[PDB]
């Protein structure tokens, strides 16, 4: 529930990811879009990133409105 | 490294909560006994290389994804519980 | 390709060139000598704890050792139970 | 001993490395040159060249000096 705890968990997943499917498959990520993709942290915030052979790079937060 | 994040937390919160399966349903898909999935969901036990493969095929992930979370969790845990104890004990053999 | 036990690294890439016995290494890490030899003789794995001791002892990262253990367990599993697992597991996610 | 086996092991370590010390510390690597390219011994003839990044070894090559 807690946004901090969710963020920590999304970050964990980003660091653990090995293929884009690791971030696209979990439906709790609601992954949207070599282009930049993003995962839902909650209703307001998303983690943007570029997928690379070496994992996630240029990670940022975005509040689309 | 912040708090340790058990792979069971990812399983429960990022798959089970949104999809809705019961522990037993996942156990049936993976081909394992239901308590083995509980153990993980309740964060009572780790994920084996074998369980990692089953999860990866079942849930469209890589097996390393699950072992990496297990790695980071075992390691954050050890550093919290025994870190200050170990860094004061071990003799350095390599410059 | 072949599974590579973290013990092979310890033996071939450290122990051989340095020269220490299993006991000397064991003393340095603060563990019983059979724990180290299990590893060196590739009969058991490296725990997070062991990885910490190793990384401090040998100036590496602890993830170095756990990554080798991870790759090893996974290659092993894959070529022992891989087809058995891919043939039987039900796919719940697109 | 076998060169292929040693190569396999060096590739293993490269993939497992999290920090440059992981490649510098094993004396069997005989690491030579932190952002500059480095190389590890495979045997007396062959070395793996690479560049270290935050995200691990990049541009892995073989070089035989000479």
Numbering used by the authors:
A (entry chain D): 23 to 55, 61 to 92
B (entry chain C): 5 to 99
C (entry chain A): 6 to 99
D (entry chain B): 23 to 55, 60 to 92
From the paper:
GraTA (Growth rate affecting Toxin–Antitoxin) is a type II TA module recently discovered in Pseudomonas putida. By sequence similarity, GraTA is most closely related to the higBA TA family. Here we show that GraA does not contain unstructured regions and forms a globular dimer while the toxin GraT contains an N-terminal intrinsically disordered region that is key for transcriptional regulation of the graTA operon as well as for the RNase activity of GraT. GraA binds tightly to the graTA operator and GraT prevents this interaction through steric interference from its N-terminal disordered region.
We determined the structure of the GraTA toxin–antitoxin complex at 2.2 Å resolution. With one His-tagged GraT monomer bound to each GraA monomer, a GraT-GraA2-GraT hetero-tetramer (hisGraT2A2 for short) is formed. Binding of GraT does not affect the structure of the GraA monomer but the relative orientation of each monomer in the GraA dimer is somewhat displaced. Upon binding of GraT, there is a 2.2° relative rotation of the GraA helix α3, which results in a 1.6 Å decrease of the distance between the HTH motifs. GraT binds on a negatively charged surface area of GraA, which is located opposite to the DNA binding surface. The contact surface area of one GraT monomer with GraA2 is 488 Å2. In GraT, residues S27, E30, R31, K32, A38, R43, D44, S47 and G50 are involved in hydrogen bonds with the GraA residues R7, E13, E18, D64, T66 and N72. In particular, A34, M35, A38, A39, P48 and P49 of GraT interact with a hydrophobic pocket on the surface of GraA formed by I9, I14, F19, M23, L63, F69 and L73. In GraT, on the other hand, the first 22 N-terminal residues together with the 6-His tag are located in an interstitial space and could not be traced due to lack of electron density. Instead, GraA inactivates GraT by inhibiting its binding to the ribosome due to steric hindrance via clashes between GraA and the ribosomal RNA as well as ribosomal protein S13.
